[PDB]
Amino acid sequence: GKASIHDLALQKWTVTNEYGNITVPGKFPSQAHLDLHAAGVIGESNNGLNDFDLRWIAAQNWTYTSKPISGLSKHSDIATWLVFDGLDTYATVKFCDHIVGTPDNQFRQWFYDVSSALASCKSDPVLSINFGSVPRIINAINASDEVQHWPASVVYPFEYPNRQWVRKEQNDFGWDWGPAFSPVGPWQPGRIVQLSKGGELYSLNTDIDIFRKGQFNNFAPDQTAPWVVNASLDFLGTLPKHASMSVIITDASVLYSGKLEGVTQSDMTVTGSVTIDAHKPKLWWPRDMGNQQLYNITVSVSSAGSKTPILVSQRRVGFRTILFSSGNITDAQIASGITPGNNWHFEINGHEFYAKGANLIPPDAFWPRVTSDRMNRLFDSVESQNFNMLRVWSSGTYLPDWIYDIADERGVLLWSEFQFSDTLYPDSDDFKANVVGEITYNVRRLNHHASLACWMGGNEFENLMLPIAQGADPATYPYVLGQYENLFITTLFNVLAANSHSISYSPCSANNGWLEIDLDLPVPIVERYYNTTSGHIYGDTDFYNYDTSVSFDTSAYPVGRFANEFGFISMPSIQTWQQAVDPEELSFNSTTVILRNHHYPAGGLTRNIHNSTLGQVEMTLAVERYYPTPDKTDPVANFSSWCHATQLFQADMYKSEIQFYRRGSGLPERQLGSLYWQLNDIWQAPTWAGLEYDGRWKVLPYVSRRTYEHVIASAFWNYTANELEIWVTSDLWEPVAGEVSLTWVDLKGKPIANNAGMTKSTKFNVGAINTTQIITANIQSDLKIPDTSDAVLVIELTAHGKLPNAASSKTTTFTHHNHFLPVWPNQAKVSDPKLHLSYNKSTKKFTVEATAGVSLYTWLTHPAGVLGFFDDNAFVLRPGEKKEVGFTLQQDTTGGKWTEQVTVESLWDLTTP
Amino acid sequence: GKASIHDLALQKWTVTNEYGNITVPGKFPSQAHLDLHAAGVIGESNNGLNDFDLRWIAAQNWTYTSKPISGLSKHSDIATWLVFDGLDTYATVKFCDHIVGTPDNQFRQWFYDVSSALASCKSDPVLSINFGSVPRIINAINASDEVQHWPASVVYPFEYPNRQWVRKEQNDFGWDWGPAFSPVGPWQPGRIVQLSKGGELYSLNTDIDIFRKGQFNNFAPDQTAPWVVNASLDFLGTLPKHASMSVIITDASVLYSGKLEGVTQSDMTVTGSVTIDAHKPKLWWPRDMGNQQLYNITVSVSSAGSKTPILVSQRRVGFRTILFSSGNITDAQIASGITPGNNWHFEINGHEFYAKGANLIPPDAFWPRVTSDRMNRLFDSVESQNFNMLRVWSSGTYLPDWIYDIADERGVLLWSEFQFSDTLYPDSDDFKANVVGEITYNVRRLNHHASLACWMGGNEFENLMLPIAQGADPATYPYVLGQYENLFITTLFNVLAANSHSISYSPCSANNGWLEIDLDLPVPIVERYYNTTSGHIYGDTDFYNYDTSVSFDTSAYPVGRFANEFGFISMPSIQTWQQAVDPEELSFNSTTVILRNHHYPAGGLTRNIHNSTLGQVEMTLAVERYYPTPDKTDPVANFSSWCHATQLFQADMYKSEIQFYRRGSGLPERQLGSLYWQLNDIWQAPTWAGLEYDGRWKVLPYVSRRTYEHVIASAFWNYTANELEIWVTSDLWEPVAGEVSLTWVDLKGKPIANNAGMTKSTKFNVGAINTTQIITANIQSDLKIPDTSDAVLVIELTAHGKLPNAASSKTTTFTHHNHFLPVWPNQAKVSDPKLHLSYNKSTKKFTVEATAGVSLYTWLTHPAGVLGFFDDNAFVLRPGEKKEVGFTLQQDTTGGKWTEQVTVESLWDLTTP
Ligand SMILES: *[C@@H]1O[C@H](CO)[C@@H](O[C@@H]2O[C@H](CO)[C@@H](O[C@@H]3O[C@H](CO[C@H]4O[C@H](CO[C@H]5O[C@H](CO)[C@@H](O)[C@H](O)[C@@H]5O[C@H]5O[C@H](CO)[C@@H](O)[C@H](O)[C@@H]5O)[C@@H](O)[C@H](O[C@H]5O[C@H](CO)[C@@H](O)[C@H](O)[C@@H]5O[C@H]5O[C@H](CO)[C@@H](O)[C@H](O)[C@@H]5O)[C@@H]4O)[C@@H](O)[C@H](O[C@H]4O[C@H](CO)[C@@H](O)[C@H](O)[C@@H]4O[C@H]4O[C@H](CO)[C@@H](O)[C@H](O)[C@@H]4O[C@H]4O[C@H](CO)[C@@H](O)[C@H](O)[C@@H]4O)[C@@H]3O)[C@H](O)[C@H]2NC(C)=O)[C@H](O)[C@H]1NC(C)=O
Ligand SMILES: *[C@@H]1O[C@H](CO)[C@@H](O[C@@H]2O[C@H](CO)[C@@H](O[C@@H]3O[C@H](CO[C@H]4O[C@H](CO[C@H]5O[C@H](CO)[C@@H](O)[C@H](O)[C@@H]5O[C@H]5O[C@H](CO)[C@@H](O)[C@H](O)[C@@H]5O)[C@@H](O)[C@H](O)[C@@H]4O)[C@@H](O)[C@H](O[C@H]4O[C@H](CO)[C@@H](O)[C@H](O)[C@@H]4O[C@H]4O[C@H](CO)[C@@H](O)[C@H](O)[C@@H]4O)[C@@H]3O)[C@H](O)[C@H]2NC(C)=O)[C@H](O)[C@H]1NC(C)=O
Ligand code: NA
Structure with a gap:
C-alpha cells in the first residue's frame, strides 16, 4: 500500500495569457517570464530597458495547464492530493474543471484533496493553475475604503505601489538595486499524491529541534547538559491512534538508535523526543572554527500491530548551540570595561566570535532558474573572502532547503529573516492568519539546518519605518506601534517559540535590544525602543553616509556593537554591462545605464531619470574627489576605466569601515560583527554589490578578503x-x-x-x-x-x-x-611601473612584475569566457618583487585559452589617454 | 524683391502618434522610427527581432507638427508656397488648420500655395503633416472589388502584401536581404517660399541635357559633331512674356559665356539651348579611363526691361556620351566572328568598355540618416575594388543629387532604374498620372549628372514576372502584357525621350533586346521578347544556382553578353553580428540569427523559421562540400569561424564566375560586363553583400578586387x-x-x-x-x-x-x-604555417610572414573600433616571402591602438580546436 506520486515536473504544461492570443510550452517549476523567453516571445528579461518594456506581462493573468494526467487510480478506497511546495502568488487551482483552491501566499506549502473532482471526471483530469496579475489585485485591495491605509511616506513605493497587501517577495515590485518583474508561476516543486486506506502516509514537512536540555530562545544554554532531539512530523492522511516513533542518527557509524518518548499526535502531525548524553555527539562549528560535523537522522512512525513504518522522514542535522544575544550588558561585562547598554552579538557553542560577511539578496529576479552550480560558485566566493556569516536579507524570500544545505556543510552561518521589509504591514485577522501559515511552515521547515543562526521579524522597522510613521502621523502612531508588537512579537515570537527552543529572535533587523523576554507577558518581548541613557550603547549599526567629503573620516562612522549594513554603490565591469546593454549604450551616463541605476528609486512607475541621476552623481563625485579621473580616447576604454575607479572608491571605503569595526572588538563597545551591504547582484546595474550578476568579483571582495x-x-x-x-x-x-x-x-x-x-x-x-x-x-x-x-x-x-x-x-x-x-590616490605621483605578466601552465600561477617602479592597485582582469577569482588582486607591487597569483577556475568556455586573454593594469593606467 | 525662404529644418517639430499617447521631439528631414529611437522610446531599429517587435509603428499614423512659424509677411502682394522635396508617403498637409494637400508619392516634389490659409490665420501658422499607415491604406485599396487584382504568384509578398499599389520604396515592405519597417516622414528637405510681385522667381528643378548634335536615345552618336547644351528650368511663380536666357560654363577658366537660342516658355517652365564647337569642351571619362572633367553651368533668366535676372540655376555637368546598346548584332559584328542576336553593352564617348562592379541597394532602411561620410566610405570601397559601374537597383529609390555628385567626380557610372520591382503593377489613369509626375520629376532632376549611364524601367519583368504571369493566368496574360508595354514603353519611354536626348533606355533590367525603336509607333520600342533563333545570343544574364555541387563548374554558368546579377549569400563578420544581436544569440542557427536571414523570405507576416532555414542550409552545405568545417571549443570562436568559411565559399564562387564572364570578352559572345549581386548590406544579416552594414569588407571584395x-x-x-x-x-x-x-x-x-x-x-x-x-x-x-x-x-x-x-x-x-x-580547399593537407604579424608605424605597413610552410587564404581582421580596408587580403603566402599590407584608415575610434588588435589567420586555423 505504498504512496503513489506523480511529480508535476514530468507532466506536460502549456502556458496561456489572459487575452487568448499567447500560447507557449510551459515548465514546472517555472514562472511566465521564463517560459515566454524560452519560446522566443521575449528577450532575456534582464536586458536593456525591459524593466519598462515587459510590464505588459505583470499586468495580466497567466495560466499553467497540463495535458490530461494519466495513471491515477479511480478506486474510491484512495485519497488523491495536490501538494504544492510553492505557487507565486494569487492563483486559482482547478482539477477536472473544478475550483479546488485559491492560494494567496508565495511562502506556503498548499495541499488540496481532489478525490471527488477525480471521481466526477469523465476522462483523464486536467490540472490548471490560473495566476493573477499581482499589481491589479493589490491595487483592487487597496482601493477599498474598508481596509487600512498608511501615510504616503510609510508605503512609498520603489516601482509598484501597494506591496504591503501581498505575501510575495517584496523585491519583485522593484528595489533600489533590482528590477520589478512581478513574476508568477509554479515557482517551487509540486506533485500529486495518491494514498490508499491503511497504507503509507505522505510526509509534508518535518521540524527537528536539537537543543541543550533546559534551553530557551535568546538565553545562553548550559554547555554541559544533555542534547534533546525533538522530532515533529506533518503528513497526509490517516495515522492510527497509539502511534510509536523510532530514530536512527548516523554520521552524515551510528550515534544513536532508539525509540522516542512523550509521543503526541493529532490529525496531521506526530511528535516525539529523545535525550542523548552530552558526551556522544561531535559538535558543528562554522568555517575556520572547527569541523562541520553533520548527521543524518531518519525518523520512522509505526502503528500498534504494524510490522513496518507507515511514515519515514530523513533530514541532515548538526549538534550545536547558536545564540543571538541582545539583552542588557551585565554588571560583569561592565566591570570588565565594556560600555553599558545592550548586547548585539552571536555565540557558537558558548563562545563569542567576530562575525564577518555580507548581506545576501536574491541572485535572480526569477527564483526557478537559480541553480546549484550558480549557488555553489557564490558560496566559493563567500568562503574565499573569509566569511563566517551571511545575513539573508528580507524581503526576497525563505531559502529553499537545498541552499541551507550548502551553508550547513561549508559552515556559513545564516542569519535569517521573515519576509517583511521597509514598510508597515496590515494586521487584520485574515492577513495574520495567512502570515501564521507562512511563519509556521517555514520555521518548522528550516529549523533542523545547522547553518540557521537566528530569525529576525523583518527589515528596518524600529530604526527607520516606525519613526517615519511617528513623524508622518503622530496621532495614529500608538495604534500602528501596537500592530507591530502584535504581529512581530505576540504572534510571531510565540509561533517561533512553539516550534523551536534553539533559534533566537528579534522582532526586526536593527533595534536597541530587549528589556524582558517572558512568555507570560501579553507582549512577550519588551523592547527597549528609545528608553535609553546618555553614554550607553545599544544595537547594531547602519552606515550610508553619501557625503563623499567624510567617507574616510573615522569620526563619522557609527560606534556600535555590530555592523549589519554599510555601503556605497559602484558600477559593474564593462564585461558585465556588455551582457545586458547595447554597445552604443556603454557610457557612464547613457540613458539605458542611468535608467538601470535604481539608486535612487523612481517612487512609482515613471521613467525617473532625475532620481537615478542622483546615484550617477554620487559615484562621479567620489571618484573626482579621491581617484584619477579617466580621459581615455577610445570611448569604450573610457567607460571601462570610469567603471573601475568607482570600484576603487567602494573597496577603499569598505576597508576603511571594516578595519574600524574590527578594532572596536578591543574598545569599550566590544564590537563583534561586520556584514557589508551587499554581497551580490540580481542583475547588471550600478549597486552596492561586491559580486556581479554572473559572479565576477569587483575590487571590493579582493579588499574585504584581506580585511577579513x-x-x-x-x-x-x-x-x-x-x-x-x-x-x-x-x-x-x-x-x-x-x-x-x-x-x-x-x-x-x-x-x-x-x-x-x-x-x-x-x-x-x-x-x-x-x-x-x-x-x-x-x-x-x-x-x-x-x-x-x-x-x-x-x-x-x-x-x-x-x-x-x-x-x-x-x-x-x-x-x-x-x-x-x-x-x-589622485595626488600620488605614480609613473609607468612597466608591468610584466606571464602564465605558467604547470604551476597554474600568473607571475606579475613591476619592472620600472611601484605599482598601486595592481589589477588583473579575467576575460568574459571564464568564471572564478584570483587569490589576490588590487595590491601594491614594488619592482623586482615577483608576485605569483593563482586563479580558482569555476567554469571555462574558452578551452583553456582564457589565460592568454588575462590583462594587468594599475592606478597609472587610469591617467593615460 | 528677393525670394524669402524658411528652411523647414530650422523650424521646431513635434511628433505624435495616432492614439494621443506618444509625443516626442521631431526632426525635419526624418522618419518616425528615427525620432522615436532618438527619444528613447525604442532601441536601434536594426537590433534583435525588431522587424517583428516594431510593427506597431508601421501600423499607425504619425503626425509631424511645427510650432507657430514666425517671420512670414502677411502682405497680399505676396505668394506663399510650401515646397517639399520628399514626403514618405501618403500624407495630409495642413497650414493654419486647412488641408492644403494630400501627397501620395515618395518620389515627387510637392508644392502648395498657402497664401489664403495664411491670410485667414488669426495667429502665426502651424504646419502639420499627418502621415498614414501605409499597409492599412494599401490593404484598403486592395480590398475593393473595383481595382485590379493579380494571381497570388505575381503579387506574392516578402513581408507586407499589396506594395504594388503604392509609390513608395518597395523594399520598405521587406526584401530577401532586409527588414520591413515601412517608415514615414518628411524624408527629404523642404521649405517655405515667399515670392513678391515683380520679383525673384524660385527654382524647383532644372533639366540640363548635354548631347551631340543629332543624337537620339539608344543610338550611337556622332563623335565629331558639335555639343548642344539644352537647359529647361521649372519655377514658381510668374515669368513675364518674352524672357531671355544666358549661360556661363566654367571649369568646375570660362568654356563659354553666351545667350541661349530658341527660347520657349509656359506657366512654370522656361527652356533654351546653345551649340558649342566639338573642339572646345574636355571630355568626362569613368575612373581609369581618363579624367573626370566637370564644369559648372550657371543659367540666368531675364525679362525684357529688367536689369538683373529673376531666375538663376546652377548645376555641375560633364561633356560625354554614354550609350546603352541593346539592338541587333550587326552584319559587321557577325563577320568579325561575334555570335548573332542582340547586344547588351555600354559605350563611353564612342568606345566599348568592359563594365566591372556590383548592384547598389539602399545602405539603410531609413534614408534620412544616410550620411555623406557613410557614402564617401562606400565609394572608396567601390573604387578600391576596381569598379567602373554600379547598378542602382530598383526598388529602393531615386538617389538624391548629392550621391550622384559623388559618382560624377569619382567616375563611377550609375546604371539607374525606375522604382518598379519583382511584381506587376496597376495601369489605371490615376496611377499612371502619379507615375508620370514621378518619372518626369526624377528624369529631369538627374539628367545633368555625368555619372548617369542609362534608365531602365524596372527590375525583373520580361525575364521573371511576365512569364510567371503567363503561367499563372494564360487567359489574362495578353492584357497584362499590354499594360506593361503601355506603362513601361509607351508612357515611360516617351517621357524620358521628351526630357533627354543623351540617356538610353530599356523597359526592364533584363531582356532580349529590341527589334525597333521609333517614336512614330504606338509602342515605340518593339521588344524581341521570345522571337529568338537557336544558336543566337541575346541579353544580359543572371545566375543564382544554389545547387552547391555545380558552383565551380563553368559548364553551368550562363553564356551571355553581360552579367548584371549573380551571387550566393554568406554570414557577416561576428563583429558585425555583435552590433545587432545579443551575446547569447551568437551561433550559426540561433533563433534570432535564423529569423534575420530573409533568404528565403516569409511570404507574408509570419515568423517563418522554415523558409529562413533554407538559406541557413545553403550556406552549411556549401562549406561542408568545399571548406574545412570548424569545430572550435569556444562557441564564440566557433560561430566566428563558421561565418568566415561561408565567406570563403562566396568569394571563390564569385571569382569563378567573374573570370569566366571576363574571358568571354574574347569569345563569340563578346561579353562586356560583370555586376555581382550585391555590393552592400542594409542591416546585419546573412546576405549576398560584399560590404557589411557598417562598411566592413567580407572576403568577397578582396577577391573581386584582384579579379577586376x-x-x-x-x-x-x-x-x-x-x-x-x-x-x-x-x-x-x-x-x-x-x-x-x-x-x-x-x-x-x-x-x-x-x-x-x-x-x-x-x-x-x-x-x-x-x-x-x-x-x-x-x-x-x-x-x-x-x-x-x-x-x-x-x-x-x-x-x-x-x-x-x-x-x-x-x-x-x-x-x-x-x-x-x-x-x-577541404582536401588540402595544410600544416601550421606559423604566421608572424607586425606593424611599422613609420611605413604604416603590416608585415605578414609564413615561417613554417605555405599559408592559404591568409586573412587579416581589423578590430571593431576602426573603419577601412587592407590593400590585400585572402592571399597565398610562401615561407620566407615577406608581404607588406597597408590599410586605408577611414575612421578610428581607438586613438591609434587598433593596429595592436589586428590579427592574422589562414585556412589552417579553421581546422584547430
Ligand atoms: C517538540 O516540538 C513541538 C513542536 O514541533 C512542541 O509542541 C508544541 O508545543 C508548543 C508549546 O506548548 C505549542 O504551542 C502552543 O500552540 C498553541 C496553538 O495550538 C494549536 O495550534 C497548533 C498549530 O497547529 C498547526 O500546525 C500544526 C503543526 O504542523 C498542525 O499539526 C496543525 O494541523 C495546524 O496546522 C494548520 O495551521 C498552520 C498554521 O497554524 C498551517 O501552517 C498548516 O498548514 C495548517 O493549516 C497545534 O500544534 C496545536 O497542537 C496541540 O494541541 C492540540 C490540543 O489543543 C493537540 O491535539 C495536538 O496534538 C497538540 O498537542 C501538543 O501541544 C499541546 C500544547 O498546545 C500540548 O498541551 C500537548 O500536550 C501536545 O504537546 C493546537 O491545535 C498556542 O495557542 C499556544 O499559545 C499559548 O501558550 C503560549 C505558551 O505555550 C503562550 O505564550 C501564548 O500567549 C498562549 O497562551 C495564552 O493563551 C492561552 C489560551 O489560548 C492561555 O491558556 C494562556 O494562559 C495564555 O493566555 C494568557 O495570557 C494572555 C496574554 O499573554 C491573556 O490575555 C490571557 O487572558 C491569559 O492570561 C502555544 O503557542 C505547539 O502547539 C506544539 N506543537 C505541536 C505540533 O505539538 C513540543 O512541545 C516539543 N517537545 C519538547 C520535548 O520540547
Ligand atoms: C486572474 O487570476 C485571479 C487569481 O487567480 C483570479 O481571481 C480569482 O478567481 C477565482 C475564481 O473566480 C476566485 O475564487 C472563487 O472565489 C469565490 C468568492 O468570490 C468572492 O471573493 C473574491 C474575493 O477576492 C479577494 O481578492 C479581491 C481582489 O481580487 C479583493 O478585492 C477581495 O477583498 C478578496 O481579498 C481578500 O481575500 C483574499 C483571499 O481570497 C486575500 O488574499 C486578500 O488579502 C483579502 O483579504 C472576489 O474576487 C469575488 O468577486 C467575490 O467577492 C468563491 O465562491 C469560489 O468558490 C469556489 O471554489 C472554492 C474552492 O476555492 C469552493 O470551496 C467553493 O465551493 C466554490 O467551488 C464551487 O464553485 C466553483 C466555481 O465558482 C466550481 O468550479 C467548483 O467545482 C465548485 O462547484 C472561488 O473560491 C478567487 O477568489 C479570485 N482570487 C482573487 C481575486 O484574488 C481571476 O479570475 C483571474 N482572471 C482571469 C481573467 O482569468
Ligand atoms: Na491619523
Missing part, C-alpha cells in the same frame, strides 16, 4: 591632525604574537632615507578577539618624508597561532599585506 | 576531365604583352620536382578588351604531381601598357597574383 583575515595590521589616518596609527587586530580565540614590517619607499621603489624616521619592524602581542596599537606617528612632526606625493608605506604582518578547535598541535602562520599612502 | 584588375591570369579547372587551363584577360583598349610565372610547390613550400612538368614562366600577347589561352594541362597525363593534396600552383602576372587616354608616355606596370589548388 584572522590577523590584520590596519592603518588609521587622521588627516586633519595628520596623524597615522597602526593597529593589529585578531579574531582568534587565544592570544597571538608576531611582527609587522614597515617599509617606506618612494614611487620608484627607492627606500626613503632612515625609513622616514619610522622603525623598519615591530613585534606585537594581541589578545583573543582583540586589538593592539603598535605605531603612532605625526606625519610632519615625527616622520621625515621628503615628498608625501612620492611616498608609500608597505605593511606586512606575520603571526603564529591556532584556529579555534584545531586538532593538530602544529601552529598556523598568519600573514596580511597592506599599505598606507600619505596622500589621496 | 585590368590584366589578370585566371585558372580554369575542368575537374571531371581533370584539365587545367590558364588564360590571360585584359580590359585595356590596346594590346599588351607580359609574362606569367608559374611556380609549383608543396604545402611546406618546397618546390615540386621539375615544376610538376610545367614551364616556370611564359610570355603572352593579349588583344584590346580580349583574352588569350597560355597554358593547357591534364593534371594526371601532362603533369607530375606526387600528391595533389600536397600541392599548390602560385601564379604571378606582370604586364606593361597604358590606361585609356593616359597623358604621360611612361607605361604603367600591371601585376596580378593568383593561385591554383588541384584539390578542394
